[PDB]
Amino acid sequence: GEDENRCVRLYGPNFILQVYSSQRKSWHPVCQDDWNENYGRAACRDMGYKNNFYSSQGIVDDSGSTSFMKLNTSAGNVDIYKKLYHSDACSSKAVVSLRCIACGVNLNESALPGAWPWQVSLHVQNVHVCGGSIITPEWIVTAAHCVEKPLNNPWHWTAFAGILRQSFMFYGAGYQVEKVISHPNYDSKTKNNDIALMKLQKPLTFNDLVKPVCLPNPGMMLQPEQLCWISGWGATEEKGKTSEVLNAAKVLLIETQRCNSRYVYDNLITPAMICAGFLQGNVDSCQGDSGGPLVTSKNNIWWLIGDTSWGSGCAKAYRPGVYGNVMVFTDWIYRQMRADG
Amino acid sequence: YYFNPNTATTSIGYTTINSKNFYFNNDGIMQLGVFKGPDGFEYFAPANTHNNNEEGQSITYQNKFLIFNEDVYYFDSSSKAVTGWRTIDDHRFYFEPNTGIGANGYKTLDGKNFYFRNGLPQFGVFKGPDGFEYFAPANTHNNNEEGQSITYQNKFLVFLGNRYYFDSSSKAVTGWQTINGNTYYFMPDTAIAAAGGFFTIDGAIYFFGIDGVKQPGI
């Protein structure tokens, strides 16, 4: 009962802790009574975050559902999720909110230092090949086509964080990647499920210039056309190369029913893919921005939407770019972090 | 400029002054950078670069790299710039015998062809005197060295999302091609097979699936 009756999930933009109820086949929140920091740490560790704990507090219930996995005290030194049991309603009037890692905060054309602390550059043979996105001190998200077949040893890659100038990414100064994990479903032709995990050999030290980017929690309600941003080293000019500077471009999401139209991609886009162009063109991703982060701001937190997959003109819009859906893979990401622990 | 106190002649080339070594060009101008000394290449660094060294004085500087006006060098334990193949941190670099700079571009060597960028062989497809070639990692085919060009005939190559196709001569094709009944197009300036959306080729419109195969569309 470890692939069901022991699964916890944070929910919503407010980080509402939940526990699965096999008896009723549902996700339920947890009442705040009897709860302390220790069970918050246990719920974080179970979720693959290991020792990362940020804050837990009670928040007035807003989802509206009337049911709770109430905790026990006299059960003994047993599994934490051996205790959580159902109840009609607690008297504390508060549900638990649990943040396992501080993320999604940045300092307030080219991008200034500390504006995208979660951006990294990946160096195969001293040359910028793919970007990335920090999610924890020792895990970076990128694409599967970056690390496929010929290039798949962790000994080929190296990461640079907090440095803005490609000229300033010296040899022997990056972070060595100690493992490369590609999604098993990844299909080299359709590039479906194009996401890879690249575990660094040493943890990243977080400061004003280096910081994580939060993962998409379930139930985010992305509006039809958000206002995202795209970052990475590329070339705004076509027929270009890896830009000397890190840039950033406002991009607008595109509905999958429009992006799969026959003027755009005629069903090329699968459920695990996301489009984000910009009307009037003049802005999109580009080479060297493949494997880079697409992020948005909702409820005061920078969220990770996806990572770059492919395009057909790259600032020649009416053929916009495509990114993998981080939300869909988040459970596999959690599993991979959990097993490695 | 330095003039000999005895003969008043301007110094040229490697010169030792008050036990301090300096280099002067053919015009007698003191130079900063790397030049060949009697025992090998030496670095005449700016002032105060090491132990309050004077401007243009050779400084002890080996067992680390050197970036100077986009040029790359490396000095061994003897403070002399290294040339030829050298294994640094389990990686091989090649430096020009004449100048010692890091290698750049296609460079045939002893029957093995590479494509250097700042002295480090690169992986992938890069144009050479005959065309493009699959410069591949080590031991990818017949005990080939790291980045050495390898024989890759009549089969596709996928690399960072780039789909190349090679012919019988182990050179990547370009322009229109037909393979196993599937019509392709490969960008002439990169040999990258167009893929994934409408493309403007020869002043027309062509749609290619992300496998790269063309879509007729009439």
Residue numbers in the entry:
A (entry chain B): 142 to 249, 260 to 492
B (entry chain A): 2399 to 2616
Article sentences:
To understand how TcsH recognizes TMPRSS2, we set out to determine the structure of full-length TcsH in complex with the ectodomain of TMPRSS2. Because TMPRSS2 simultaneously undergoes autoproteolysis, we introduced an R255Q mutation that prevents the self-cleavage and generated an extracellular domain fragment of TMPRSS2 namely TMPRSS2106-492/R255Q or TMPRSS2ECD. TMPRSS2ECD was used for forming the complex with TcsH at neutral pH. The cryo-EM analysis reconstituted a complex map: 3.2 Å for residues 1-2387 including the “core” domains (GTD, CPD, and DRBD) and 6.0 Å for the rest part. Notably, an extra lobe of EM density was observed at the C-terminal tip of the CROPs domain and inferred as the bound TMPRSS2ECD. The structure of the TcsH part presents a TcdA-like “closed” conformation, of which the CROPs domain curves downward alongside the DRBD domain. The CROPs domain is bridged to the DRBD domain through the CROP unit-IV, which likely forms a relatively stable configuration of the “core” domains and the CROP unit-I to IV. However, the CROP unit-V and VI along with the presumable TMPRSS2ECD were in low resolution, possibly due to the flexibility of these regions in the full-length toxin. The newly determined TcsH2236-2618-TMPRSS2ECD complex map together with the earlier 3.2 Å EM map for TcsH allows us to reconstitute the atomic model of the TcsH-TMPRSS2 complex. Since the TMPRSS2 binding site in TcsH is far away from the core domains and would unlikely cause conformational change to the toxin, we believe that it could represent the structure of native TcsH at neutral pH.
Hemorrhagic toxin (TcsH) is a major virulence factor produced by Paeniclostridium sordellii, which is a non-negligible threat to women undergoing childbirth or abortions. Similar to other LCTs, TcsH comprises four structural domains: an N-terminal glucosyltransferase domain (GTD), a cysteine protease domain (CPD), a combined transmembrane delivery and receptor-binding domain (DRBD), and a C-terminal combined repetitive oligopeptides (CROPs) domain. TMPRSS2 is a type II transmembrane protein that contains an extracellular domain consisting of a low-density lipoprotein receptor class A (LDLRA) domain, a scavenger receptor cysteine-rich (SRCR) domain, and a serine protease domain (SPD). Here, we show the cryo-EM structures of the TcsH-TMPRSS2 complex and uncover that TcsH binds to the serine protease domain (SPD) of TMPRSS2 through the CROP unit-VI.
